[PDB]
Subunit: 119 residues, 2 copies
Amino acid sequence: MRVLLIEKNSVLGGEIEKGLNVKGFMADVTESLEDGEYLMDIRNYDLVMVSDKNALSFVSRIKEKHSSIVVLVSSDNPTSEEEVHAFEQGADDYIAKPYRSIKALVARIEARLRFWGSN
Amino acid sequence: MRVLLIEKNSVLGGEIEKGLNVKGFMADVTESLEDGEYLMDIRNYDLVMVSDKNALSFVSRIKEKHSSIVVLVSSDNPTSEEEVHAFEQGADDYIAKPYRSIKALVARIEARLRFWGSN
């Protein structure tokens, strides 16, 4: 299994990446979803998470191609409007920024898919 | 599709019950998971949510029988430990109490079990 972490920052991205590594999943740190989108074409991942406002259209369009892949959207303002909108667009799970904790993010990931990658 | 909500409260029961009703699902508010469990044996449901600390064992044992049903666990203290433990136990999704909003709860529910088909 391979996880795609998209975050302009470095602390959050590195934290999430190193966290998922504990389980044994290959997490990649990026900036904009654009990178993961163009990279997902040459590579084959299973988990894709991005912390941007453009995650709606990103995940929405993704479901059209890879409806199997797990689309995870995160935002600094965890509001119901963003949650319902993101879910309706394509997002499979909404994450608040900051998040509860690394352990939570990973746990929710493996539990969200539960179709690949295990300890 | 039938949605079962377990909460000894009142405001939450009515708020959630009506919230889901907006879509077109059977929302029923109960007290303890014991009720929903004993009732789920006499009736066939699809969505099951409970806001109790004993949801871990409840959802954990449920997955053993109905691996299809969506187990939604909620707690007043939305902590990573509770989230990770909830998923590891059997919980499909973790909900914070209070939650972001009704629209969010319902949206997440219908989004979690969208493969249910039968519009």
